[PDB]
Structure 1
Amino acid sequence: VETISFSFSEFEPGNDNLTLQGAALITQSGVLQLTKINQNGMPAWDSTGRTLYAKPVHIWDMTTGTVASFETRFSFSIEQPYTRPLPADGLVFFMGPTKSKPAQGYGYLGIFNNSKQDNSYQTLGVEFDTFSNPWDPPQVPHIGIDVNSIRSIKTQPFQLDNGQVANVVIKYDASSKILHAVLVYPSSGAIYTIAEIVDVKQVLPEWVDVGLSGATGAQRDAAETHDVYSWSFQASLPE
């Protein structure tokens, strides 16, 4: 069995186990700020930042046809300081081709280049979308399961607890092909759940990079924070 796992209770600056891209940075306080925060403490618009684990993950093997089961957990907080314009754009946990660089920002969340369903993306993602684009359901924020497109195959609205820490659990059972995600706000006790069938063999390459990506809006002050406090991951390829 081929296993891989990591667990960051907090982030330490200078760590070489994480690849920071775009605006992403680790603070001295141990927080991973996916998108830029200005000198005045306000989140900057037109910002995109990602963080990829430094080792690729063996998700499936073409030879034996076996696929890995995996689980990831992370805590984040989003703060929306302005009433107008509408805050944007959100953050997303994703898996895709190795050696990737950030894509388009804004509503594409740093992982897509357009709104088409393209098999060449080879990307699986679980988004926490805060801005309603024309390809989105009208309710925001919402959790969404993205398969080769920013147009989710399944969506679940949730109420943002402004600036409060949200705990997320995403689990994939290779046997049943079910991807199930849970979001809990300890502050209010709110629990949201979403699940959908996804056969990763039809989506992802055998080896993938796992990461988190965040983006702020295309217009002035259409922004919010995308802070991550911890992140753990584990995958097992039956072999």
Structure 2
Amino acid sequence: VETISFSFSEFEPGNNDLTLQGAAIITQSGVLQLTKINQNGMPAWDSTGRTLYTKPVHIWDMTTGTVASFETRFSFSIEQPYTRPLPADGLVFFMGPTKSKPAQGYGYLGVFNNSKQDNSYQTLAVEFDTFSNPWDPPQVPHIGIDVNSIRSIKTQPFQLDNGQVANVVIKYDASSKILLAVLVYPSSGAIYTIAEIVDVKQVLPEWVDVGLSGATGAQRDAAETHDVYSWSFHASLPET
């Protein structure tokens, strides 16, 4: 069996196991600010940032046909400071081709480049979407399972608890092909779930980079924070 795992109880500046891209920075306090926080302490619009684990993950093997099961957990907080304009745009956990650089921002969350479901993306992602674009369901925010497209194969509306910490658990079982995501707000006790069938060997390349990405809006003050406090990941590829 081939396994890989990491766990950051808090983010460590300078720890090379993580790569920061775009606007992403890690504070001395250990918080990953995916999108820029201005000097005044407020979230900047037109910002896109990501972080990738620096070691590629072997998600499946074409020769043996084996597929890995994996799990990832993280705690994040989104703070929407203004009543108007509408906040944006969201944050997301993604898995895709190695050596990737940030893609388009805004509604594409730094992961996609359009609203097409293109197999060439070879990307799987679980989004926490705060702005309703033309391809989105009207309810925001919502959790979404994205398979080679920003247009989610399934969505689940959830109520934001402004500025509070949400705990996320995402798990993929290769035998059942079930991808599940759960969001819990300790503050209110709210629990949300979403799941769908995803055959990773039909979507992802054999080796992938895993990461987190966040993006704020296309107009002044159409923004919110996209802070992450912790992040763990584990994958196991059976020999079979």
TM-score (norm: length of structure 1) = 1.00
Q: Structure 1: how far apart are the matches of 2:173 and 2:13? A: 33
1:180 partner SS? strand
Q: Secondary structure at the match of 1:74?
A: strand
Cα RMSD between the aligned structures? 0.3
Output one character per residue of 1:162-194: Cα deviation in whole Å (capped at 9) or x when no partner: 000000000000000000110000000000000
What is the Cα deviation at residue 52 of structure 1? Answer: 0.1
**Cα offsets for 1:100-135 (capped at 9, x unmatched):** 000000000000000001000000000000000000
| Local SS of the residue matching 1:202 | helix
Give 3-state SS (helix, strand or coil) of 2:126's partner: strand
User: How much does 1:14 deviate?
Assistant: 1.0
Q: Deviations over 1:147-172 (max 9, x none)?
A: 00000000000000000000000000
Give CA-to-partner distance per residue, 1:26-76, whole Å, 9 cap, x none: 000100000000000000000000000000000000000010000000000
The corresponding residue for 1:174 is 174
Give the match for residue 30 of structure 1: 30
Q: Name the SS of the counterpart of 2:201 in structure 1.
A: helix
Q: Which runs of 5+ in 1 are unaligned?
A: none
2:2 and 2:13 map into 1 onto residues whose CA distance is: 29
Partner of 1:107, secondary structure, is helix
Cα displacement (A) at 1:98: 0.1
Instruction: Give the distance between the partners of 2:191 and 2:168, measured in 1 at CA.
Output: 10
Aligned-residue offset at 1:13: 1.1
In structure 1, how many angstroms separate the alpha carbons of the residues matched to 2:9 and 2:62? 34
> Displacement of 1:211 after TM fit?
0.1
Residue number in structure 1 paired with 2:115: 115
Report the Cα distance in structure 2 between the residues aligned to 1:148 and 1:6, rounded to whole angstroms: 25
Cα displacement (A) at 1:137: 0.2
> CA offsets per residue over residues 78-101 of structure 1, 9 Å max, x none?
000001100000000000000000
Residue 84 (str. 1) matches residue 84 (str. 2): yes
Moved over 6 A (4+): none
TM superposition score normalised by structure 2: 0.99
Q: Offset at 1:218?
A: 0.3
Cα distance in structure 2, aligned partners of 1:75 and 1:81: 20
Q: How far, CA to CA, are the matches of 1:176 and 1:17 in structure 2? A: 31
Offset, 1:144: 0.1
Tell me, in whole angstroms, the C-alpha distance in 2 between the residues paired with 1:116 and 1:175: 28
Q: Which residue of 2 aligns with 1:54?
A: 54
Q: Displacement of 1:15 after TM fit?
A: 1.0
What secondary structure does 1:189 align onto? coil
Give unpaired runs (5+ residues) of structure 2: none
* Secondary structure, counterpart of 1:100 in structure 2: coil
SS at 1:151 equivalent: coil
Distance 2:139 2:170 in 1: 22
Query: What is the Cα deviation at residue 12 of structure 1?
Result: 1.4
Count of residue correspondences:
239
- Whole-angstrom distance in 1 between the partners of 2:218 and 2:173: 37
